[PDB]
Amino acid sequence: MTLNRNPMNYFAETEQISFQPGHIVRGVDFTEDPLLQGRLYSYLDTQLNRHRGPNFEQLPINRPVSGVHNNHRDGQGQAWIHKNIHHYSPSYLNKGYPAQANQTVGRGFFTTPGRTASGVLNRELSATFDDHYTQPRLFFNSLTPVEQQFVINAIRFEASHVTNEQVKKNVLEQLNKISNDVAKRVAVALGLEAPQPDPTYYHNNVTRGVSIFNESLPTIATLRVGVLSTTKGGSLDKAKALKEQLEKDGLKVTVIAEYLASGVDQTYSAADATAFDAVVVAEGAERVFSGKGAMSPLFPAGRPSQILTDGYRWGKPVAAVGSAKKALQSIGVEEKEAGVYAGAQDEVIKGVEEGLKVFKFLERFAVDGD
Amino acid sequence: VDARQRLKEVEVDDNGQFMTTDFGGNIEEQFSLKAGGRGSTLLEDFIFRQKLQHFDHERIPERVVHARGAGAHGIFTSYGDWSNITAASFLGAKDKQTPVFVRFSTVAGSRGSADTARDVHGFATRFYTDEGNFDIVGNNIPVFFIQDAIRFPDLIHSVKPSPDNEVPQAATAHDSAWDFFSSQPSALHTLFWAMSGNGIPRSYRHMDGFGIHTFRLVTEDGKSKLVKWHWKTKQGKAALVWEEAQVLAGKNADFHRQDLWDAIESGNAPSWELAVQLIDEDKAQAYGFDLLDPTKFLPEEFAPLQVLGEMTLNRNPMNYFAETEQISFQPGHIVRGVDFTEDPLLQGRLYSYLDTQLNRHRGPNFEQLPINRPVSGVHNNHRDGQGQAWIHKNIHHYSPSYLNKGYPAQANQTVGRGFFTTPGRTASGVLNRELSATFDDHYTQPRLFFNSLTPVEQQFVINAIRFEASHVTNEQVKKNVLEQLNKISNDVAKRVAVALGLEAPQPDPTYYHNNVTRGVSIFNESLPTIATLRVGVLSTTKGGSLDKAKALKEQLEKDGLKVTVIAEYLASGVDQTYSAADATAFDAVVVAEGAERVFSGKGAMSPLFPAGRPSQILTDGYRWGKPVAAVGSAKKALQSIGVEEKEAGVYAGAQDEVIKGVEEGLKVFKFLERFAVDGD
Amino acid sequence: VDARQRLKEVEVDDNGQFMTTDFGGNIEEQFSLKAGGRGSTLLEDFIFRQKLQHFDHERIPERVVHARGAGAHGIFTSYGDWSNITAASFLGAKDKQTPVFVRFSTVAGSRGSADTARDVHGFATRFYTDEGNFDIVGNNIPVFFIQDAIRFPDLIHSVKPSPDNEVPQAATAHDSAWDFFSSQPSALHTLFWAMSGNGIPRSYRHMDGFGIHTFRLVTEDGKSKLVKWHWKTKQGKAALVWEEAQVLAGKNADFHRQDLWDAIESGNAPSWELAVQLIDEDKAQAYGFDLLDPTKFLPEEFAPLQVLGEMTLNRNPMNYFAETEQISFQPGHIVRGVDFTEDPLLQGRLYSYLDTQLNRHRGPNFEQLPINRPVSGVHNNHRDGQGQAWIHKNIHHYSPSYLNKGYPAQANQTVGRGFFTTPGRTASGVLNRELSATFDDHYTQPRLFFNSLTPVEQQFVINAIRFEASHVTNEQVKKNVLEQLNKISNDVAKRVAVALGLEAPQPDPTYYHNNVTRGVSIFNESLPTIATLRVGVLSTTKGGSLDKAKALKEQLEKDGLKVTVIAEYLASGVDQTYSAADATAFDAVVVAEGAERVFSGKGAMSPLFPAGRPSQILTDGYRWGKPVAAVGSAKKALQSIGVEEKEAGVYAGAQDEVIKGVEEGLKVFKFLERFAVDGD
Numbered sequence A: 001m002t003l004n005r006n007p008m009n010y011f012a013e014t015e016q017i018s019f020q021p022g023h024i025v026r027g028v029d030f031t032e033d034p035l036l037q038g039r040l041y042s043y044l045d046t047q048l049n050r051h052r053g054p055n056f057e058q059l060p061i062n063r064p065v066s067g068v069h070n071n072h073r074d075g076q077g078q079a080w081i082h083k084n085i086h087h088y089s090p091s092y093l094n095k096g097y098p099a100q101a102n103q104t105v106g107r108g109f110f111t112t113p114g115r116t117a118s119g120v121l122n123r124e125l126s127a128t129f130d131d132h133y134t135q136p137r138l139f140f141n142s143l144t145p146v147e148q149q150f151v152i153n154a155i156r157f158e159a160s161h162v163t164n165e166q167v168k169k170n171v172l173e174q175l176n177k178i179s180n181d182v183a184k185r186v187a188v189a190l191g192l193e194a195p196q197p198d199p200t201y202y203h204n205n206v207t208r209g210v211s212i213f214n215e216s217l218p219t220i221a222t223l224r225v226g227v228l229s230t231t232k233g234g235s236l237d238k239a240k241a242l243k244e245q246l247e248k249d250g251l252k253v254t255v256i257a258e259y260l261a262s263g264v265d266q267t268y269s270a271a272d273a274t275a276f277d278a279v280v281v282a283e284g285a286e287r288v289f290s291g292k293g294a295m296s297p298l299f300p301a302g303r304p305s306q307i308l309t310d311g312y313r314w315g316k317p318v319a320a321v322g323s324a325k326k327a328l329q330s331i332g333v334e335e336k337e338a339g340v341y342a343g344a345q346d347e348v349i350k351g352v353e354e355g356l357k358v359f360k361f362l363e364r365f366a367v368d369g370d
Numbered sequence B, C: 001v002d003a004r005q006r007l008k009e010v011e012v013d014d015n016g017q018f019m020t021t022d023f024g025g026n027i028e029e030q031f032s033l034k035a036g037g038r039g040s041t042l043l044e045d046f047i048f049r050q051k052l053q054h055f056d057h058e059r060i061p062e063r064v065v066h067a068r069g070a071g072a073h074g075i076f077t078s079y080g081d082w083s084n085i086t087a088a089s090f091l092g093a094k095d096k097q098t099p100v101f102v103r104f105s106t107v108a109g110s111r112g113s114a115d116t117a118r119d120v121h122g123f124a125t126r127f128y129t130d131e132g133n134f135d136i137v138g139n140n141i142p143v144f145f146i147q148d149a150i151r152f153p154d155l156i157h158s159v160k161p162s163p164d165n166e167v168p169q170a171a172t173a174h175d176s177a178w179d180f181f182s183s184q185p186s187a188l189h190t191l192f193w194a195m196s197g198n199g200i201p202r203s204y205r206h207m208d209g210f211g212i213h214t215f216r217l218v219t220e221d222g223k224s225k226l227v228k229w230h231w232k233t234k235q236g237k238a239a240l241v242w243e244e245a246q247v248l249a250g251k252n253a254d255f256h257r258q259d260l261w262d263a264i265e266s267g268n269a270p271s272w273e274l275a276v277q278l279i280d281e282d283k284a285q286a287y288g289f290d291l292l293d294p295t296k297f298l299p300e301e302f303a304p305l306q307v308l309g310e311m312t313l314n315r316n317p318m319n320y321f322a323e324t325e326q327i328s329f330q331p332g333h334i335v336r337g338v339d340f341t342e343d344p345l346l347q348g349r350l351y352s353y354l355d356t357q358l359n360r361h362r363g364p365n366f367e368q369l370p371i372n373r374p375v376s377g378v379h380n381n382h383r384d385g386q387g388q389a390w391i392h393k394n395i396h397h398y399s400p401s402y403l404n405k406g407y408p409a410q411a412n413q414t415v416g417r418g419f420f421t422t423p424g425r426t427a428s429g430v431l432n433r434e435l436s437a438t439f440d441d442h443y444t445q446p447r448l449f450f451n452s453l454t455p456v457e458q459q460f461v462i463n464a465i466r467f468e469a470s471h472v473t474n475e476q477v478k479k480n481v482l483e484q485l486n487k488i489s490n491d492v493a494k495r496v497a498v499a500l501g502l503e504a505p506q507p508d509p510t511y512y513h514n515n516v517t518r519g520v521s522i523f524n525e526s527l528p529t530i531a532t533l534r535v536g537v538l539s540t541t542k543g544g545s546l547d548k549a550k551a552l553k554e555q556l557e558k559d560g561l562k563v564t565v566i567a568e569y570l571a572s573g574v575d576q577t578y579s580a581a582d583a584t585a586f587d588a589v590v591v592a593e594g595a596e597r598v599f600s601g602k603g604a605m606s607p608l609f610p611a612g613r614p615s616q617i618l619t620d621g622y623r624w625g626k627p628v629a630a631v632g633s634a635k636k637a638l639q640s641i642g643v644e645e646k647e648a649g650v651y652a653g654a655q656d657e658v659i660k661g662v663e664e665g666l667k668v669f670k671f672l673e674r675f676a677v678d679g680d
């Protein structure tokens, strides 16, 4: 599936749309997943709240393309007028229409015939559901070492915000049942002590496709490069030429400067590293990285220096064009490094576009033990 | 021409189709999904829940007033080019046609009440003009109970059932209503109209209509005249009698709505002529009252009616809910060429009607409903809202803007044919929560109404007040009514007080007078046509009565009447049974020949109908003022109940003689000689 | 003990107080704020808008079914400690008292319809127990139209008015309803109950009540028995006649709701005994039908009723809307000691009643409403919602938590006295959208019902079907009805087909039988008490009749009766006028001495009442099976219409002789000799 159209009104289309798992057709059926079973009730019921009426599938974005024929009448905000005045089944007076459809006639929906119900009526869950630790380990084991650090570092950040000491202890108990290393590593940040190992659910099994960074992107199209430049000297024209070249590969390039000159897409005040997939300093733009240049009324002090610092420290491809290397060495970044490119314009582009395929450079993040 | 042409886009035909969910896909909805043979129903049965949920949410709130009603589609044709008085598009050219919808109602009952309860009646018309919807929301009575809109809750709370037990339904015959009438003497004028024939019309098609308020007509230059809206029925004014109305309320609660349905369906579309009164702005207080007073009407001797057009109701709704129930009238649905006045009652209505739609429709987008949509087109900066059916292309939904290029543009008096308030209008004085002293004359006009009614009609009004005030359990309130009634007429206070077992206070000549005006009476005139009126032909399955009756029916139908042939059971020519029959459903009764057999002896006692049924239909019909008839030997039926052929409205003889007598009598409709008047 | 004790905290007294806005502050709200005396109303008049806004939004949706109804507060007292059969707290100790609320209704009419329309009636009871609210939501008829809940919209859509015109109101006498009954033969059983006296009860206090569904009673150990709920009226079963009900629907739409109000207000609180049938779980298919079939009832010869208690309705509501209108019953309001069964109809109801409250109340917090609140206390993790009336102290609104320390706690069979499904219950088989073949006998039990009625009662059912099926305009549907009727009884098919003018189909003896069961009849038993019943004493203001009439009244009232003294006008002893009087309002009519003057001559023609009024009241009253009487010379009145004192139910003579006679006649209530039976 390819998404080629934008909404015309956000509210009418995006906001008012009502998804349900119970929106099912012939050739599909549910299973006895206790989570799924409840969703079927919930999604239909909650529309009464959002839409204030039972006629929310009469809304243009909820209308089917297949046609609606039944004996449902009235309702709040009824948009249709119904021709059939015999709105009940079975009737002599409607002459059998709307007709009843099933497996054999009318291509109607049907539950799977092989399905059965066996046992006592219970408010319980199957014992096959009681292994809560094996698959999270399976997931963790299947992650690259840096990605593993991210998950642990994420838990360190999150569980740090918990103000109840005992709850944090309770987290460690559950974390420990999965992996002691994780329990050890987290307990450092929380300033607590790792419990004794539990070999019950521990294992080293692995499966594929659960990782994000370890593979390279199929395409770098639409990704954004930010060209840090300046309004005075020769930086702008070089930058403009850099722009057209980059767009051809599929990228979207934003030319940043002190103010909105001829080729300037964005200002330094309105720019930040988060808006870009890669940052590249144009040549002669070094003037704004130190001295009076870094302190202008046109932007907060240290802004260009921060964007470069931010972009590098966040794992993004960083670049300098020719003489621009002083900017990268202003913050302590050597061109020899991985994900950092300095040299001629064509040399840098080729490096950057390759880097975008890498997308994120995990060498720039510290891993436990060291 | 099909007045419902715009509504075609939303008509859904389920014929030849399979059952579907509301989101599409073919289904069967006659069995629930169970776990095992005799098992429990499964929560994963999406088909069940989707079906029941729509049923569970089928109900919307009924109207706060005028809950019980019915409606139809039609066309309004203008008689001229009225730009000399108004800039309105739909009155702007001769032969110009506008689609309309009209809804008739009763004010105090709920959705299930009887059409034939004594009440004020509603007459709300919408004009789907090409300059926007314009609504004349009015009643069948030219005056209202109160002079300030802020008193509407107080009035309505009183007339509606008591908050403790919710008794009584659709009636003013209780203490709270007559407490209000006495405590707020402004209500007395409309009270009298309610107690007249207007309180019990024969049909929606047999009542006049009124805008009640004084409005304004404005021309493109901005010149204005005060106006009053009228609807005069081309079928004539007719009313029932209270003793009849009560029985009819049981045998057919849907009497009025069915009659309107049948008339339209049978090609006999009802029609009204739209008339107005034009008054100069300086003559607002000229005619003995303030024209911003809604408890007063302007006699036609002071200002004759000039008709501008005629409206005909020729189409019925396809779905009652989608069309009749969901429609939302507002007095604030106004267009260029019309404007409001400083009527304290009208001003409040403008707020109320718009606000109350939020309650009934649960959203601000109720004019997107097919029956509320105009034919003229809607362009503005209104966005979002609950149940928004449209998608708006303009993403610059504010004015003034550079980016939308000035569109949608601003229209006014000079440009865009836009609405404008009358330029001559002014505001002068202190800000006050008071009413003008021109509004305090509450007794003069009810007398004028009473004086202008035929002697029998006056008795009806008194007979109504006697019945109603009898149900009041508090003696002092009844004393208060006599005090207020006496200020109108000493005769009325005297005559009513007999029933209440009280004595009328000594006369007050302060407001007494003998003036008279036209058009306020119902019975004194004869109907223009007898078309659609119904005759019930009492016959029998024994002998040759049925064949004779069949010949009687076809003859009557050719003249335009609707005939029901009643007998013991549904034989070849029999339309209805005696069990299913009652006098209230018919405008005239005629006993066919040989039908005397069921009025006496074994014939009057069959298991096929309750005892005395044929005799009751004739007895009720005669005692209720209807034309009665017997054919040939059928005369025995008339003396079975004590009715002599010599009388008025009674016809006996050969069929040709009988048909003619009945049809002549139906024009009279009701024979007022058969009712006793006070004294005598 | 006043069941509305909990409701005291939310009662508002406006006595002795000044007017206020809804947000506080003292005001005057009778004049709008205007610009310049006879100016326009100002938008800055907050007092006007706040007052009108509440008025405009006063309406809430009426119930999707059972819209027309009335209710009262009461107390339920247990007769014993029923832990042997159920773990229910409200049945757990002898002489134990539980507050209740009961609402009686009709199924097909809207909020304004008549109480005396032919319909199934509702009998819904809430038990405000100390273990949560428990609701028995039931009818006055032990059987239902359909066997699956997914077919409920189809049934209701058919019986309710036609979607094109909304005709007819509160009636099954149209093509769509009888189309359904014939096409869905499951509906036939309840159809017969509807056409019997059950379709037109005398009062709410004169009908039995049924849970209809089979439920389960569970003990603390978890042992279960299948159960059926019964309410047996301690006032006796009584019904009207159709010809009476129709006239009554017009003269008093509020007949049932007023009667319940007056009874409680007069110290005569109605009472019912709560009875049950206990069936072993293994005996579900034992008695000739499936006990999960709601189109079946279980004869008392197979399982007699055992009474567990008595409930009495001794309190009236203070506000109808807040209490009666807003109350929300659900079969899913269940407690420990009760459980559901795999009745396909009951299963669906559980979804519907909860879901539909979202529509009527516009929110999920409707059990926060005072009349829906339990007396047992509510503690859970439900938060937010529209119109949330509570503030929650616990900021840990999730259940598996350390921080709330496990509260609110989880309760079950063993701990916390919590609810539990019956432990023996199982599910076996394929997942199916079909119904059991044990459900396929639609004709045997209606035959059983018909056979168990007195010959006149049998005629009534037939007379109702003749009337109803007469209104069907499609001949083929009537043919279809005869086919289904024939499968039950050939005689019924024969007798009905006469009225329809059709031919009786040839007999089908497949389902024919002569079996009989008890308790399903209304007339064959006499009323336990004549208390609360109403007698209308027709008198006159002329002569000594009034004093004579007054003396009769004083005598009657001690026995429990309610007497209305009728005359030309409201004299010293006069309760009601002749204009305001009708036979439908009385259980018995008795002419006082000297009242003969108004039954003939000038007396019968007065301006104070419609002509023939006193004569009709006697005529109607006699013809409707009621006890009729004359005192002394009053015999002149009875022979005016052809009624000899020699007859049954008619009493003439001395006052003392008459009194004893009427009171005797009232126990019989209705005299069935006065109605003709087929063949004769």
Ligand code: HEM
Binding pocket: B062, B063, B064, B065, B066, B069, B103, B104, B105, B122, B123, B124, B137, B138, B139, B143, B144, B148, B149, B150, B152, B211, B212, B213, B294, B327, B328, B329, B345, B346, B348, B349, B352, B353, B356, B357, B360, C052, C056
């Ligand atoms: C001469 C005075 C009045 C006339 C002629 C009149 C007429 C009517 C009519 C015909 C309707 C029925 C509309 C329909 O059929 O859909 C109606 C409803 C209504 N009226 Fe009045 N009325 C009057 C007084 C008032 C006043 C003074 C107020 C408020 C201050 C008011 C508020 C309302 C409201 C809120 C509705 C409900 C409309 C809806 O739910 O669609 N009325 N009126």
Ligand code: HEM
Binding pocket: B052, B056, C062, C063, C064, C065, C066, C069, C103, C104, C105, C121, C122, C123, C124, C137, C138, C139, C144, C148, C149, C150, C152, C211, C212, C213, C294, C327, C328, C329, C345, C348, C349, C352, C353, C356, C357, C360
């Ligand atoms: C044996 C079968 C049934 C019985 C005894 C029954 C009885 C009743 C009664 C007495 C009421 C009145 C509630 C009140 O007085 O406040 C009611 C209302 C209602 N019933 Fe039924 N009914 C039955 C069948 C059904 C079925 C099969 C459904 C749905 C599948 C249903 C859905 C409803 C709904 C939605 C209401 C409206 C209640 C409200 O709006 O608060 N009923 N019923």
